Amino acid sequence: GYFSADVYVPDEWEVAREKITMSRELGQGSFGMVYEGVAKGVVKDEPETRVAIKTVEAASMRERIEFLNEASVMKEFNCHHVVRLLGVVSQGQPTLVIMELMTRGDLKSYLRSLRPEMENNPVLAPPSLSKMIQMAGEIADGMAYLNANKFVHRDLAARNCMVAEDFTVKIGDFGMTRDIYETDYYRKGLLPVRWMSPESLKDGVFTTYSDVWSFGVVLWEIATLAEQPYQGLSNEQVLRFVMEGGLLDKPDNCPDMLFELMRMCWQYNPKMRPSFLEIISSIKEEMEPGFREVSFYYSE
Ligand SMILES: Cc1nn(C2CCNCC2)cc1Nc1ncc(Cl)c(-c2cnc3ccccn23)n1
């Protein structure tokens, strides 16, 4: 005959609704509206914590179940450089998922906000080597953690990183900016072709080594303040260019070292690319002191 129905099963992440409050709306995701707020007793030794609250009500039960199970993916991760899931409210409506708040948003958006506006007003200078490296190492650390946890990301990109209040960069909540930056995708399956390794453009397979490639592109993103890679090239022309050993250009005024890093990631042969761990090792001396205390890299 056959094999039989999708459910959500409450667990230890279940949090009491009356412990949650919402205020400022941050935007809207696929499943519904996303708010900022306060959660009580969801971080150890913190009476109260600022959080992000993703909501589904209107919505069908199939839908909210699927939003529940998808968000839950984040439950198996505990890393300073990966955006946390703090709780779930699945009992009653509306359906809630409580996440770590990243006040400064997705990295692509943060990066763009640093672009000088077209007025006559004084402006902060472009990010320094040092700050840029700090971001690279935080991102790399989250990726290393993910890798060691048997994960392949497949969509590593600035849009898929977030930025905390203290400027700490982290691997973003999975799948939260795809639709928003829709032009960053191409239906080769909607895929982020400008971030893709040559091997992945060929056979459609993703590895940690193709996550490194994309990391290279994320660094380029930082250096250009979130320009579209292969700017002038059509989607199709990108495939050929990249598969044929083509490479992104050293950005105007990009420090040598950051470009060197990018360069090591964009090596054609995946087996010649540094691992995430190796990447961090090459730049640890440049990292803010506190990285020893918080990073996966330096941990047991
Ligand atoms: C991603 C993000 N954007 N923003 C605002 C930045 C200033 N402009 C208005 C947007 C605040 C967050 N922080 C954040 N932190 C955690 C999560 Cl989980 C989310 C999140 C998840 N899905 C969505 C969808 C839209 C907006 C935010 N999020 N956002």
UniProtKB/Swiss-Prot annotation:
Instruction: Please state every residue range assigned to the domain named Protein kinase.
Output: 20-291
Task: Tell me what effect the entry lists for residue 297 to F.
Answer: No effect on GRB10-binding
Task: Give the superkingdom in one word.
Answer: Eukaryota
Which positions are linked by Glycyl lysine isopeptide (Lys-Gly) (interchain with G-Cter in ubiquitin)?
Answer: 188
Cytoplasmic side of membrane: 2-300
Residues annotated as carrying Phosphoserine in the record are 295, 299
Relate the outcome reported for changing residue 273 to S. Answer: In IGF1RES; significant decrease in IGF1-induced DNA synthesis and AKT1 phosphorylation in patient fibroblasts
Positions carrying Phosphotyrosine are: 2, 181, 185-186
UniProt binding sites for ATP? 26-34, 54
Q: What is this protein called?
A: Insulin-like growth factor 1 receptor beta chain
* Catalytic residues (UniProt): 155 (proton acceptor)
